Design a protein around this ligand. Structure first.
Ligand SMILES: *[C@@H]1O[C@H](CO[C@@H]2O[C@@H](C)[C@@H](O)[C@@H](O)[C@@H]2O)[C@@H](O[C@@H]2O[C@H](CO)[C@@H](O[C@@H]3O[C@H](CO)[C@@H](O)[C@H](O)[C@@H]3O)[C@H](O)[C@H]2NC(C)=O)[C@H](O)[C@H]1NC(C)=O
Ligand SMILES: CCCC[C@H](N[C@@H](CCc1ccccc1)C(=O)O)C(=O)N[C@@H](Cc1c[nH]c2ccccc12)C(=O)O
Ligand SMILES: *[C@@H]1O[C@H](CO)[C@@H](O)[C@H](O)[C@H]1NC(C)=O
Ligand SMILES: [Cl-]
Ligand SMILES: [Cl-]
Ligand SMILES: [Zn+2]
Length: 586
């Protein structure tokens, strides 16, 4: 009985490595070379992997997991009973795979064109406009144009995508696809836990929002910013207003303590995409963690091709399921923002290497948030002014209270601003999946949440036919989002714990764990667990306790909360957006 189940897991593990490696190869070849031929091969490998999933999943379902004594085998077999899309009938499975490919291709090849002028891709062209233009109409052109071309083009697919992903979820024992996705956390209290964490971050976010709103009023004019209303969504330096640090120049707390232009410093010093990834690899090995293998450097795509290939630019990390071949695909630009992205992606690679010897079913993060958090933890140390000065990308900024508050503001514009964005994406999709948002009101309900959680309004009133969620990568690519909310909370818990393990004293935001072997050992022991244990065990190995908590993030930013409250009170700011119905008049 126990013996047949053990044998089954061994056979599943052997055969899964082969077929998933072939799938990953076809998927990579399409993502790095969008053509009719690579698309056709990819759809064929989709059917091959479904045949495997159906064979082994059907077997797994013949086991009564209740009667298995070994808890590791029990856990693997329970997981393999979920066929995901391979539960669908063949005709629906083919339709679903084609819909997914059509949606992700539509996003990745969309362009926005000037009349009898040039056509801009999202990366680098439109993202550069959003980051650097300080002209309301130019930002509006890029913001609206991207939604018109990418978002509107996904709408034709999304209702059928929803029907099919939900159908597969029901065939695997869930009530809808959002139930299935939430199950990855194995935490019955997930929704309440996330809401409580969101509420703890409100003082910081509301104060940041009011301060930034005032600064935008100063630059863009009183006729275009309502000091008691939501902020227009195209003014925050980022296409989705999900991180705001590119408008640091407009909001700097102490302009008499300026920072060196880090993009120009990186360019003058000869930085390249490969150098950026080499620096990330060096930070990981300084903690005693694993270097990426030589193969990574030969096979990764670390910059946009110049040879005519169309590619999926959106950065991502790839496991080829053979314990040897790991790769990053990123259209890297030489700037500080993308150095942080490089660390994020190298954190995924680290996790892949740490859990490579577990059974494939257990080769995941402790929960999806943990997978997202590893690289960001190291990037918190890289981002310190002390570390950036050691890279010759900032001047010496220490010993200055003004530089200290400036740094905390730079960090808040990304980390605090992202909290409400990362909360709302799957609040929307969970309600699409459970049927309480229909295609009649996709876009209206999206904007209701953008208002409620982020305090943003669209600069141009939306019209029927708009599908602004489709203009965000994870929606057409069907990548869950609450992982990023979880990550941004727990990365500060991990930073706090690793800094204490490294012997740091003083304010958390001054900590840099470079070269700490004690810090590396904490992370390594947790990552080696993969998905073999409930995630509170990995939380315990890193932090010494088992809960998710916003306390670390709040501690990191405490000096900035104090500064923001004093500043906002001086100016008479009304926190929030009680005039929540305000929208731009022109
Ligand atoms: C329940 O079963 C798990 C899994 O057992 C493993 O997978 C099965 C499908 C069979 O193939 C088994 O033969 C196989 O061991 C047991 O977990 C395993 O325990 C062993 C011994 O404690 C671990 O061995 C280690 O292996 C590494 C190399 O990977 C060595 O460096 C170590 O020195 C040590 O020998 C093994 O890692 C572990 N495997 C997993 C996936 O956790 C588990 O012990 C068992 N439970 C009980 C109560 O018996
Ligand atoms: C353009 C960079 C995208 C990076 C990332 N890319 C994903 C691809 C995942 C995937 C899975 C399956 C198939 C294909 C792809 C990843 O590695 O998790 C991403 O999406 N980050 C989020 C949040 C974020 C913004 N800024 C950051 C800075 C640091 C850390 C996180 C974020 C975002 O951009 O919204
Ligand atoms: C892109 O795909 C086509 C079609 O399969 C192939 O002929 C070509 O060699 C590929 N290009 C690269 C750079 O791999
Ligand atoms: Cl939007
Ligand atoms: Cl998730
Ligand atoms: Zn990630």
């Amino acid at each position: 009985d126990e013996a047949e189940a053990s044998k089954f897991v061994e056979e599943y593990d052997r055969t899964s490595q082969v077929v998933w490696n072939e799938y990953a190869g076809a998927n990579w070849n399409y993502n790095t070379n969008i053509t009719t031929e690579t698309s056709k091969i990819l759809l064929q490998k989709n059917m091959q992997i479904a045949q495997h999933t159906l064979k082994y999943g059907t077997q797994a379902r013949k086991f009564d997991v209740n009667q298995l004594q070994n808890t590791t085998i029990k856990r693997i077999i329970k997981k393999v009973q979920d066929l995901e899309r391979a539960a669908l009938p063949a005709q629906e499975l083919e339709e679903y795979n084609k819909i997914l490919l059509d949606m992700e291709t539509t996003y990745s090849v969309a362009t926005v064109c000037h009349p009898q002028g040039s056509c801009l891709q999202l990366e680098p062209d439109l993202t550069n406009v959003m980051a650097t233009s300080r002209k309301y109409e130019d930002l509006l052109w890029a913001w609206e144009g991207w939604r018109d071309k990418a978002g509107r083009a996904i709408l034709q697919f999304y209702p059928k995508y929803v029907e099919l992903i939900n159908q597969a979820a029901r065939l695997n024992g869930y009530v809808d696809a959002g139930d299935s996705w939430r199950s990855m956390y194995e935490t019955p209290s997930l929704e309440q836990d996330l809401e409580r964490l969101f509420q703890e971050l409100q003082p910081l976010y509301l104060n940041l929002h009011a301060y930034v709103r005032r600064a935008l009023h100063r630059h863009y004019g009183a006729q275009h910013i309502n000091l008691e209303g939501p902020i227009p969504a195209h003014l925050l330096g980022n296409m989705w207003a999900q991180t705001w640090s590119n408008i640091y120049d407009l909001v700097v707390p102490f302009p008499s303590a300026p920072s060196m232009d880090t993009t120009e410093a990186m360019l003058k010093q000869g930085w390249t995409p490969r150098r950026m990834f080499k620096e990330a690899d060096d930070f990981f090995t300084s903690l005693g963690l694993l270097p990426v293998p030589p193969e990574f450097w030969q096979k990764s795509m670390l910059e946009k091709p110049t040879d005519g290939r169309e590619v999926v630019c959106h950065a991502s990390a790839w496991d080829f399921y053979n314990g040897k071949d790991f790769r990053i695909k990123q259209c890297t630009t030489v700037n500080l923002e993308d150095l942080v992205v490089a660390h994020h992606e190298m954190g995924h690679i680290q996790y892949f290497m740490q859990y490579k010897d577990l059974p494939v079913a257990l080769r995941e993060g402790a929960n999806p948030g943990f997978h997202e958090a590893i690289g960001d933890v190291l990037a918190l140390s890289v981002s310190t002014p002390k570390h950036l000065h050691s890279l010759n990308l900032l001047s010496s900024e220490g010993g200055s209270d003004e530089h200290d508050i400036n740094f905390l503001m730079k960090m808040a514009l990304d980390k605090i601003a992202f909290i409400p964005f990362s909360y709302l994406v799957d609040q929307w999709r969970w309600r699409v999946f459970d049927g309480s948002i229909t295609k009649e009101n996709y876009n209206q309900e999206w904007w209701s949440l953008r208002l409620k959680y982020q305090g943003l309004c669209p600069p141009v009133p939306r019209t029927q036919g708009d599908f602004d969620p489709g203009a965000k990568f994870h929606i057409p690519s069907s990548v869950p989002y609450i992982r990023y909310f979880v990550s941004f909370i727990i990365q500060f818990q991990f930073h706090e714990a690793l800094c204490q393990a490294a012997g740091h004293t003083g304010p958390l935001h001054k900590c840099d764990i470079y070269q700490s072997k004690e810090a590396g050992q904490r992370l390594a022991t947790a990552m080696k667990l993969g998905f073999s244990r409930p995630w509170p065990e990995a939380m315990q190995l890193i932090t010494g306790q088992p809960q998710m908590s916003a306390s670390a993030m709040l501690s990191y930013f405490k000096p900035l909360l104090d500064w923001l409250r004093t500043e906002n009170e001086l100016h008479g700011e009304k926190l929030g957006w009680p005039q929540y119905n305000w929208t731009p008049n022109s």
